[PDB]
Design a protein around this ligand. Structure first.
Ligand SMILES: C[C@@H]1O[C@@H](O)[C@H](O[C@H]2OC(C(=O)O)=C[C@H](O)[C@H]2O)[C@H](O)[C@H]1O
Ligand SMILES: C[C@@H]1O[C@@H](O)[C@H](O[C@H]2OC(C(=O)O)=C[C@H](O)[C@H]2O)[C@H](O)[C@H]1O
Ligand code: CA
Ligand code: CA
Lengths: 896, 884
């Protein structure tokens, strides 16, 4: 019969002044609503992003049209079909206020929102044919991708004279176009390649996918530009952009307008032909009108000592903003090529929008969210004194030094595994020839496009710049997310214990510090923005940017989980932003999306791809799940989670244990492959569980691999304590390791196995299978949680030997916590808190503060916390979160 | 015989400094008091002295004095001068190849020819710490239209070297000035004739390892010369030094220092030892590897070695920093910042080394610093005055002419943009720029505290100066100003107000850059809230209406550090970039425009050596300024090559070969005369000539019927005489007035000339001057009755009030003094009840927040200030009578 319930969704921070339609997620309790038999209303457009094991809705997405009316909150009421099929009430059926239509043929696809009409060719070298406003007025055309590169690089500036450079230009070439059409929003996904326009023959390269989100009643289009780096040693990217033509034919030069966003809400306001600050005044109204971007009165009405001499007032065709560092931008204009540029008063951080158009012809604004943070970038207006202007956003500026992704070192004469692991001992880098390659990394950039029937106010531009740099987000309530249990059971809301309250303040301290380090230490850049470093250098007073494994962190010890669970518990905007940016880096730049190592990611190093440990614990899709669902099934992360389903194939091309393994095994063709049951498997399982939850094109496969491998672990005599296994890539089964073919019993322990998502995947896995869980899997998992830090005797009693090199006791305290909850054992719960307060990691009497450093010790002033590293704070914070969720009933108890 | 003796005292410019590396200062002396070479000088010991200026009777007018580097630093330095009847040394050594200057702390060798400006730099101990100082330039021959065009418009790079022609030496015991001149000649790359003449000056002081390096260049290129890199470079010998004992430093933001080593031993997985790590960070020789912890010392092979470091400051607001193990590998980006203070060190604990740096680094962007090959036997340390990471320097015109064809069109364009264009006048050919570089030598890597200190020294080099009161008494620097009535107090508060706004707009409008730093703009656009950077004559100011005089006299009266520094910057720009130093137009500067060289009014009122006079003397005869003042002696040649009045003069005259030449008696003549009086004062190579030309043109003007009211004259370039303009062959009388004539130096120059000429002044000149001062803004009656006509096109009445004030003071006339104050307080310029405040502007109106004063422009504030200063010095007694 009838089942209905409601969920409220809030703006992430302050109520916005403007939105351009938004998408959000909502979770639903297990078994409550069936897919396709469930209606949603707002106080609404809807689809499923995930499902529970019995096929009931786990997560949905929802979309709202652009609207002047903006609420403090929004309530979605779900209703089963039963609610309408049981009432005999007549009820009205009307068309929505606004609604998208799409016309679709051989040549091209067109999307009309009511406020713009945009065309997408199905082939060719032009992504957007044109953009019309309501009236039918074309305001921009031939949107296209640009790429520029060079064949080599001089050793230094002096070497230019003796080291010639061959420049090439490329075009975005379309191969496929897709549509996910709905009434309230429509998504055009465009896939392609870059092909040569100018320079020597060059194979097509730099695969792209560009996603356009259009919303009903919106002239604002959001653009997810994703590219994959398939260059070689010889391909140096020089320039990477998005370019539109803006037709100005018909606008008097003095009615053509140029705007750049400046610093903090600022706007640069100029005309192609400037009527202000001349020796003679055409009239106050006329000057005011030009600064306002309005069409000027008829030339007969001006003071005539100006209209007669327009011939003598220069015309400014080209404009260039370049932000080549995180801290300063240049701005210049010129009459036309063959003349010098004139410099313009500039400043620190440009907020990343430019507009070209006119009072009568209309025009177009383009921008990059997070502009200066993703340097080096730029904005160019070109040929604004012609019939056709060009507006270009540069995702990578040619005014920068070229992008060099080659190895930072030659290998220092390391010749083989023995030399490599010896170098591991001093810099923490695990180098190997040919492993230090950026081949297959990706980066996604969030772009916005704004159409205008006419040059808009500067207040409007500033307001859209702010929109672009802080996209409004609607999220469900933490309490609700928790209650549904649709994003794990291992966290909970913030208890009256004064101890618990000092834990909360400590997580807040950790977050605040990590947030400030991003600014202080300038972790900004085209590729770097979003990641942070690993360990600190207390003497130099810097993070170890230049020492092997101590530099970029690359999700080591699961900081992605701490920061995401920290958002879930709290609803903090800063917390969401920190995490979002993290996830946009980690999941794109730190992982390979093509080639033999597709679906692995790279271990922490000096470059994001320098190290030879290529492992699924970096690609670990559990790190993206929380964002996948909260964003409303963000499609690019969507795509990324699918790529990872090919991770299991890697183990035939690469053994992560190749240099340390003692059992003589190597991959060989058509053979069982070796992978770890902790680190690697937790990566695999997470990707399969997610495909299962999504009921995507490989879900039956995913279900089978997960179930079979789970069952395989259950069947190992020592379960998780075994360490690894041999997987069959054809039968999708998991048998014992090469040293234990009879399954007599094997023991191989690693401090790393639990701390890259294992407890999280396993518990979710367990809840998902329910009564179909293979016999003895929960017990094997409990065995590991309990014996990890039981006594040496107890370990020896169960498995034949004590556990040698167990560390990360704080980190693993959460496993005892989990088992304590599940066995209802108070003594075990007390163990969990003891390992938290009185083993390793961050001890409760650690300094727990920042020291300020300045003067001649350091380049710029900095706050430091030398007493911690990222490994510590990630696991400390997970421990806090998970110990509170499982064993807070036992916390006060511990404290007495 | 007699003793004639006196004292003059010299104080630090702002605060007493904590370090100085020798200073040179100036002192004036009263007319007739001391004879050159006969007069002895002592400090509170014997004092390095020499003369920079002389009075007309040959007595000392300005001296210059130098003290050694000393860690004793006093609040005041007192110079006692004594007549003839009263009662730490540098060692230069000559070789065939090369000359060596030794201070007690460094020995630097200068080759006499070749492409190496400096042979080597040794310390007390004799160890070589730097070698092969050399200039680098690199250029390209084309520029692509935009970034897309780079595929279809190849670039040919050319590197170049400083090739030496002449080396001079000015040896004293306290200081030695080595002066090297030359050209830049090809080395690698595409072939090119020699160009970009240089002169580099090296000031060594006794007991200093600091070297001040003034570096000057003339741009003699054309439209196909695009400067790409400009710099100075040294080798640093490292061969004997453990990679872990070689040190890199860069000055960071404010008092910051980046501190690394070529092989880092901090921040590893294993700890070599806490004492050892702190040692590396401090720049000390690390202990023997036998004392280290062997899990580290046995693994040094696997710790990377960092050969190259690059700091690039490509805007005024942001700098990048990065390092590289070696070429073939990617660069590792380093946490950078806003504004790098512009020094870098390369060396070691054992081998010692070298810091180099540029004064005002980030304000003269785009600039940079490079260490290279720091893992080799020999590293290079390079300072870029122009960075190759920036866009090529494009000096070509900003517009194409707009289809202007001849003078009728050019003057029509002038009526709307205030720019006076002409084809081939928008040329940078012959401009210049001086950059103040500093070299510091070290026996071992210094402390970071020490580098931070030398960095701050560099950016604010200690200045000694005379008491303002003393300067005033001597009358050695003009009589048109006096030291600082409620009425006058608000005048002073208002000068402060102007100074604070102008010093502020520098930062707020970001008036920084390799060439731009120093200047400011002319007129504001109140609709856009920008200065009119893009509208013809309203952009860069280029000394229009003598702001140079205002700001310098404002320092004289006050003694303010800020004031000196603002005027110093100004002077290093306008005298260098805003004038031509070679070619047909040499000795002229360029009228205010969008580029510093875009406008076609090439005139001596820009080049006006009076603008540089105060700095020349106060600095102790800054030799670069000396050299520039000598160049302007050829200014009179240009009037045969170029008529500044060509487009506007009614009388049909044109220049012809071997004839007289026409120049104005206000704008042009004021510049010529100042040049002549300065050379005479200096007794330079051409002083007899300068005295003849000054004296003759003065006598010419006195012998003209209507004196200065005659607009112009005819000047003979061979006989050096001055006669009537073309329209009055018989000297019956001509009337031609300009509002510009008095406002570019004329009263300052004349009052100085009248005084300096003494009883030898031509009969009637002083009265011809008093006439102009008196009748400029007299009634139309008094004008018609004196000259036949009334003066048609009078304006700038506030600006001219200071002339009435001169006449009033000199003729003891109270009625005229009251007219002067009336013209100041109630004509034009800046009215007393104008707004006299700034408005803040932010939000979507402007790119960045700014303060504005739309109610003033630079013409107003320069003349307001000169007016205030001069009216107060001449007629402060009539000011109380005026208020009531
Ligand atoms: C077997 C692999 O060996 C190295 O690549 C890495 O191991 C070193 O790094 C870490 C780490 O967490 O990054 C921990 C190990 O103790 C250390 O030997 C990989 O993590 C291993 O998987
Ligand atoms: C003869 C020269 O003609 C133009 O180049 C300039 O004339 C104009 O500019 C100024 C000025 O002070 O900048 C004032 C004049 O009223 C205006 O027409 C030069 O100034 C003239 O010397
Ligand atoms: Ca990374
Ligand atoms: Ca200038």
């Amino acid at each position: 019969n009838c089942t209905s319930s409601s969920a409220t969704v809030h703006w992430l921070g302050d109520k916005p002044t403007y939105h351009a339609g938004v998408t959000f997620g909502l979770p639903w309790p297990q078994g409550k609503y069936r897919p396709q038999e469930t209606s949603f209303s707002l106080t609404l457009q809807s689809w499923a992003t995930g499902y529970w094991a019995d096929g009931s809705l786990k997560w949905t997405a929802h979309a709202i049209a652009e609207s002047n009316q903006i609420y403090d909150q929004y309530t979605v009421t779900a209703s089963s079909l039963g609610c309408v099929k049981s009432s005999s009430s007549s009820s009205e059926s009307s068309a929505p206020n606004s609604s998208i239509v799409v016309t679709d043929n051989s040549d091209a696809l067109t999307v009309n929102t009511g406020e713009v009409a945009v065309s997408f060719p199905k082939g060719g070298n032009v992504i957007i044919g044109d953009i019309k406003t309501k009236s039918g007025k074309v305001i921009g055309a031939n949107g296209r991708l640009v790429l520029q590169s060079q064949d080599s690089v001089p050793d230094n500036f002096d070497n230019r004279a003796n080291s010639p450079i061959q420049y090439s230009n490329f075009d975005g070439n379309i191969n496929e176009v897709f549509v996910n059409q709905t009434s309230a929003r429509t998504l055009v996904t465009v896939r392609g390649n870059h092909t040569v326009t100018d320079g020597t023959d060059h194979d097509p390269w730099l695969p792209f996918v560009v996603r356009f989100y259009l919303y009903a009643n919106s002239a604002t289009i959001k653009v997810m530009h994703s590219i994959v780096f398939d260059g070689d040693e010889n391909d140096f990217i020089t320039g990477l952009g998005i370019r539109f033509d803006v037709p100005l034919k018909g606008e008097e030069y003095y009615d053509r307008h140029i705007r750049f966003a400046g610093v903090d809400g600022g706007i640069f306001n100029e005309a192609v032909q400037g009527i202000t600050g001349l020796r003679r005044d055409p009239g106050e109204e006329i000057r005011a009108a030009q600064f306002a971007g309005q069409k000027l009165a008829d030339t007969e009405t001006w003071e005539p000592r100006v209209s007669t001499r327009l011939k003598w007032i220069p015309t400014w065709a080209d404009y260039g903003l370049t932000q080549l560092t995180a801290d300063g931008f240049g701005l210049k204009k010129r009459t036309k090529a063959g003349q010098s540029w004139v410099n313009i008063p500039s400043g620190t951080r440009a907020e990343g929008l430019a507009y070209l158009g006119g009072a009568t012809q209309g025009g177009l604004a383009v921008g990059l969210r997070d502009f200066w943070k993703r340097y080096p970038v730029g904005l160019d207006i070109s040929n604004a004194a012609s019939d056709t202007g060009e507006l270009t956003l540069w995702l990578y500026s040619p005014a920068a030094e070229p992008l060099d992704l080659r190895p930072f070192h030659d290998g220092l004469g390391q010749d083989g595994y023995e030399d490599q692991l010896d170098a591991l001992e001093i810099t923490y880098e695990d180098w190997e020839p040919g492993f230090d390659t950026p081949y297959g990394i990706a980066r996604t950039s969030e772009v916005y496009l704004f159409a205008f029937d006419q040059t808009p106010t500067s207040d409007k531009l500033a307001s859209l710049t702010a929109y672009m740099n802080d996209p409004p987000v609607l999220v469900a309530e933490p309490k609700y997310i928790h209650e549904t249990q649709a994003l794990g059971e291992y966290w909970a809301l913030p208890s009256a214990s004064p101890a618990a309250a000092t834990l909360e303040d400590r997580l807040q301290f950790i977050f605040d510090f990590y947030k400030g380090q991003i600014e202080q230490r300038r972790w900004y850049g085209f590729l770097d923005y979003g990641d942070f470093m690993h360990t600190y250098d207390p003497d130099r007073h810097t993070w170890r940017y230049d020492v092997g494994g101590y530099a970029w962190d690359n999700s080591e010890l699961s900081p992605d989980l701490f920061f995401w669970l920290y958002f879930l518990r709290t609803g903090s905007k800063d917390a969401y932003r920190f995490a979002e940016a993290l996830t946009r880096h980690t999941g794109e730049v730190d992982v390979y999306h093509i080639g033999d190592w597709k679906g692995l990611g790279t271990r922490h190093g000096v470059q994001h791809w320098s190290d030879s440990a290529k492992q699924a614990r970096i690609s670990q899709p559990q790190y993206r799940k929380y964002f996948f669902y909260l964003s409303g099934g963000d499609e690019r992360v969507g795509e990324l989670l699918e790529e990872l389903l090919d991770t299991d194939k890697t183990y035939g091309e690469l053994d992560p244990q190749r240099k340390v393994r003692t059992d003589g095994w190597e991959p060989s063709p058509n053979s069982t492959v070796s992978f770890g049951l902790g680190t690697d498997w937790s990566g695999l399982a997470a990707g399969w569980l997610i495909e299962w939850e999504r009921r995507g094109p490989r879900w039956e496969e995913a279900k089978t691999k997960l179930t079979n491998t789970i069952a395989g672990i259950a069947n190992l005599t020592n379960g998780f304590v075994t360490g690894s296994g041999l997987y069959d890539p054809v039968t999708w089964t998991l048998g014992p390791p090469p040293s234990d073919p009879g399954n007599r019993g094997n023991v191989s322990i690693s401090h790393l196995n639990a701390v890259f998502g294992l407890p999280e995947v396993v518990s979710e896995a367990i809840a998902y299978l329910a009564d179909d869980i293979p016999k003895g899997f929960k017990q094997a998992w409990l065995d590991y949680c309990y014996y990890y830090h039981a006594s040496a005797s107890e370990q020896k009693d169960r498995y034949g030997v004590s556990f040698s090199k167990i560390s990360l006791l704080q980190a693993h305290s959460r496993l005892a916590a989990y088992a304590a909850y599940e066995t209802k054992n108070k003594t075990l719960a007390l163990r969990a808190w003891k390992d938290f307060y009185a083993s390793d990691g961050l001890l409760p009497d650690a300094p727990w503060n920042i020291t300020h450093v300045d003067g001649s010790d350091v380049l710029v002033p900095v706050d430091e916390a030398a007493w911690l590293a990222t490994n510590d704070i990630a696991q400390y914070g997970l421990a806090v979160i998970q110990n509170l969720a499982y064993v807070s009933d036992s916390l006060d108890d511990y404290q007495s």
